Design a protein around this motif. Sequence first.
Motif, PDB file in Angstrom:
ATOM      1  N   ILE D  82       0.862  -1.178   0.000  1.00 43.81           N
ATOM      2  CA  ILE D  82       0.000   0.000   0.000  1.00 43.81           C
ATOM      3  C   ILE D  82       0.898   1.228   0.000  1.00 43.81           C
ATOM      4  O   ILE D  82       1.831   1.316   0.805  1.00 43.81           O
ATOM      5  CB  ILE D  82      -0.958   0.013   1.207  1.00 43.81           C
ATOM      6  N   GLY D  83       0.642   2.159  -0.913  1.00 46.46           N
ATOM      7  CA  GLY D  83       1.466   3.341  -1.047  1.00 46.46           C
ATOM      8  C   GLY D  83       0.809   4.566  -0.440  1.00 46.46           C
ATOM      9  O   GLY D  83      -0.407   4.718  -0.478  1.00 46.46           O
ATOM     10  N   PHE D  84       1.632   5.442   0.125  1.00 49.56           N
ATOM     11  CA  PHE D  84       1.160   6.723   0.626  1.00 49.56           C
ATOM     12  C   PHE D  84       2.154   7.798   0.223  1.00 49.56           C
ATOM     13  O   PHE D  84       3.326   7.517  -0.041  1.00 49.56           O
ATOM     14  CB  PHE D  84       0.963   6.708   2.147  1.00 49.56           C
ATOM     15  N   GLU D  85       1.675   9.038   0.168  1.00 48.27           N
ATOM     16  CA  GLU D  85       2.564  10.129  -0.203  1.00 48.27           C
ATOM     17  C   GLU D  85       2.033  11.455   0.321  1.00 48.27           C
ATOM     18  O   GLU D  85       0.829  11.620   0.540  1.00 48.27           O
ATOM     19  CB  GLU D  85       2.752  10.202  -1.723  1.00 48.27           C
ATOM     20  N   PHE D  86       2.959  12.394   0.515  1.00 53.81           N
ATOM     21  CA  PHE D  86       2.670  13.779   0.847  1.00 53.81           C
ATOM     22  C   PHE D  86       3.289  14.690  -0.200  1.00 53.81           C
ATOM     23  O   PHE D  86       4.356  14.400  -0.748  1.00 53.81           O
ATOM     24  CB  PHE D  86       3.233  14.182   2.210  1.00 53.81           C
ATOM     25  N   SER D  87       2.618  15.808  -0.454  1.00 55.45           N
ATOM     26  CA  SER D  87       3.104  16.840  -1.357  1.00 55.45           C
ATOM     27  C   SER D  87       3.051  18.180  -0.644  1.00 55.45           C
ATOM     28  O   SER D  87       2.020  18.535  -0.061  1.00 55.45           O
ATOM     29  CB  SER D  87       2.276  16.889  -2.642  1.00 55.45           C
ATOM     30  N   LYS D  88       4.159  18.918  -0.687  1.00 53.43           N
ATOM     31  CA  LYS D  88       4.243  20.233  -0.065  1.00 53.43           C
ATOM     32  C   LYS D  88       4.923  21.199  -1.021  1.00 53.43           C
ATOM     33  O   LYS D  88       5.978  20.885  -1.574  1.00 53.43           O
ATOM     34  CB  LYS D  88       5.014  20.176   1.257  1.00 53.43           C
ATOM     35  N   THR D  89       4.331  22.375  -1.196  1.00 56.18           N
ATOM     36  CA  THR D  89       4.873  23.402  -2.074  1.00 56.18           C
ATOM     37  C   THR D  89       5.549  24.481  -1.239  1.00 56.18           C
ATOM     38  O   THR D  89       4.930  25.053  -0.336  1.00 56.18           O
ATOM     39  CB  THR D  89       3.776  24.019  -2.939  1.00 56.18           C
ATOM     40  N   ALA D  90       6.809  24.755  -1.541  1.00 55.79           N
ATOM     41  CA  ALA D  90       7.570  25.740  -0.794  1.00 55.79           C
ATOM     42  C   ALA D  90       7.159  27.157  -1.192  1.00 55.79           C
ATOM     43  O   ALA D  90       6.660  27.377  -2.299  1.00 55.79           O
ATOM     44  CB  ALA D  90       9.061  25.547  -1.034  1.00 55.79           C
ATOM     45  N   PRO D  91       7.354  28.132  -0.308  1.00 53.47           N
ATOM     46  CA  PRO D  91       6.991  29.515  -0.637  1.00 53.47           C
ATOM     47  C   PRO D  91       7.857  30.067  -1.759  1.00 53.47           C
ATOM     48  O   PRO D  91       8.858  29.480  -2.171  1.00 53.47           O
ATOM     49  CB  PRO D  91       7.224  30.272   0.674  1.00 53.47           C
ATOM     50  N   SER D  92       7.447  31.236  -2.253  1.00 54.09           N
ATOM     51  CA  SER D  92       8.087  31.829  -3.421  1.00 54.09           C
ATOM     52  C   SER D  92       9.506  32.308  -3.143  1.00 54.09           C
ATOM     53  O   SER D  92      10.297  32.419  -4.084  1.00 54.09           O
ATOM     54  CB  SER D  92       7.246  32.992  -3.944  1.00 54.09           C
ATOM     55  N   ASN D  93       9.839  32.628  -1.894  1.00 60.25           N
ATOM     56  CA  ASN D  93      11.184  33.083  -1.554  1.00 60.25           C
ATOM     57  C   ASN D  93      11.635  32.498  -0.222  1.00 60.25           C
ATOM     58  O   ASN D  93      12.224  33.194   0.610  1.00 60.25           O
ATOM     59  CB  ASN D  93      11.259  34.608  -1.522  1.00 60.25           C
ATOM     60  N   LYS D  94      11.377  31.211  -0.003  1.00 59.76           N
ATOM     61  CA  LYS D  94      11.723  30.580   1.263  1.00 59.76           C
ATOM     62  C   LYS D  94      12.091  29.125   1.024  1.00 59.76           C
ATOM     63  O   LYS D  94      11.816  28.557  -0.035  1.00 59.76           O
ATOM     64  CB  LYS D  94      10.576  30.677   2.274  1.00 59.76           C
ATOM     65  N   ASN D  95      12.723  28.526   2.030  1.00 61.60           N
ATOM     66  CA  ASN D  95      13.109  27.124   2.006  1.00 61.60           C
ATOM     67  C   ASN D  95      12.234  26.334   2.967  1.00 61.60           C
ATOM     68  O   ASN D  95      11.882  26.820   4.048  1.00 61.60           O
ATOM     69  CB  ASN D  95      14.581  26.949   2.380  1.00 61.60           C
TER      70      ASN D  95
END
Lengths: 50, 50, 365, 167, 94
Positions: D82-95
């Motif tokens: 069984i697979g799981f995943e997370f996706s997160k988008t970083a800010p435009s000028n940050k880490n």
Amino acid sequence: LISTAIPFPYGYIGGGYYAPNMITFGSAPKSNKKLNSLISSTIPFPYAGY
Amino acid sequence: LFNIYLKNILYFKKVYFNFLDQWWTEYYSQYFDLICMAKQSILAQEKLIK
Amino acid sequence: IDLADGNYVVSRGDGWILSRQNQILGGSVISNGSTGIVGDLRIPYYYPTPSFNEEYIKNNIQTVFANFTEANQIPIGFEFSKTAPSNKNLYMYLQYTYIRYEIIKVLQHIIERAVLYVPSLGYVKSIEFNPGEKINKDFYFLTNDKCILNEQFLYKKILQRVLPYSNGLYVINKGDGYIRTNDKDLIGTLLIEAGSSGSIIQPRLRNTTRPLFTTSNDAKFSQQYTEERLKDAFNVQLFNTSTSLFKFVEEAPSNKNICIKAYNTYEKYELIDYQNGSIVNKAEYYLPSLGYCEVTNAPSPEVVKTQVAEDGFIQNGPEEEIVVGVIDPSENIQEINTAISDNYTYNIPNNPFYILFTVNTTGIY
Amino acid sequence: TIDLADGNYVVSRGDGWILSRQNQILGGSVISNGSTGIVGDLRVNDNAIPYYYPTPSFNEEYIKNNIQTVFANFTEANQIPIGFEFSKTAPSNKNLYMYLQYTYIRYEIIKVLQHEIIERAVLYVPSLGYVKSIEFNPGEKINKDFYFLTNDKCILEQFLYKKILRV
Amino acid sequence: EEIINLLNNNVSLMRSNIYGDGLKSTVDDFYSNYKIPYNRAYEYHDSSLDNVNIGVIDNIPEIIDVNPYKENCDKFSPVQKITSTREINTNIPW
């Protein structure tokens, strides 16, 4: 030893015991700013294909 | 020369083992056959006495 | 029917839903904002008649339309994503869409019919529901087999410019996007309802691809020979183009449905042997490249019976022609180890051959 | 301290249990400005091995059999990946730094004498994952509690008990 | 395999049976045509199942999904053989 000594399996349909191919499934729905077309899950295509 | 000496000694022991196997196959087989026939004779005489 | 007497083989297109097979693979329930993505990643049904047995149908279908026996070796896939409403439950279930191949015996003006079903793609039916809500059985059950996609009746009755090139071998890249006629390369059609998205994927397989090869003669222009010439000209290795993959994804507007037809394409390479302005020998090599996508809308509701097109190729990509000369393998090559500065003299050690050299200064010689 | 009759009880405390001292043993991801980071996993074989912490009078076989009979069966369910995943988008000028854990299901076999628990075994079934993400600046101090976990806790809190016996 | 007939003075007094081993019979002397190698097995002047762990084998999950190989069997041809029987006539008892 008898139970665990399975005959050696063959390779993939094209030959070899190395890593298989890859396939991407389940593109995320389009957001308000991003297409999100590449937000999917990558899985080995011929899993356990020996 | 010492290595050649040891190799030749081991070869001589190999020939001796071959002769031992020849004795077992060709000679001891007949003595085992005699043992089996003698056991059959003993059992037959015991059966007659009984 | 409006046809002459005889026997005909007909393709009625893909997108045929079989009867009583609606909830067989299963379904999914999503509550609030969740996205359900039910797809597949990977056996024809025969219905003969006393006149047409299994072998007759199989042979005719292979002769005219796409070879399903070979096509079953390649894999396919689809996604069919659907999002749930704000506050309402969503249930979506998946079934298979097949290709209906008929074989009819037309006497006077259809006295016999045999049908072959080849599994093409998928179809997802979704409904928005609330707990304890009654849903009519028409959504769950299909009494008769019917087509959901386009309706076609492709039938077949069963029975110059100058080239200023020098003498030698040439390899010509003739473009990309060569599909075959009569939908022989059609990997399939997907019907996407309004407010949903769908994709068709081609997984590929290691060392499992089918380049097409047609040569003038098998004596000098063999598959191995033309493969070597293509490798020399463009570095075309076919161990490549097997780890790649292509996926066509598209969402539908909120007011209409769409149909996505995906095909497998080829890149065309012509290996020619030009001698005194005449093409003595010629070979054609089609390398399966990356597919082709077409988007259409469902037509309004009559169809006409159209004959199949002539067997050949159709180019869907841009116009292209690249001619590259190659070194003849049957002629030796002599290398000049040193460079040429001002004056050089080379002694021949009677057959034609090549001499490789470089100059030490840019200039006229 | 519990309010139950005397005897043995099989208890499920839900899933989403993160263990202690092993938070970023699987490693993390650093995402620069604009891009998207997807960190996932596929529970199939070796990470799908339950952890037994037994006591006297509660061996591995006893607790395993009781939990299979009452609650979900994991021995056969762990064979299926069984697979799981997370996706997160970083800010435009940050880490952005995101790291993945394993969330388990806490199973217990308690022995209630009088109105207090006198014995307890634990069985952890690898359920899924959990990505903890932060947005950071170079040279910025991050709270030590963000990375390290001193004691186990549930990130989702239940206690399900079962006493062992028209025309 | 053999029928021993103790002939008397040509009347069979006793008839006995000698059976065979049932293995493959060769008339060529193996030892005279076998050469003891010199450069092979010229070195080296109750404990074999030690690398087997019962617990490790027991911990392996059973094989559920099997990917078949098309050609995994060949055929079965039973071995049919006929046993010959010679007769030896002798005057001295065996």
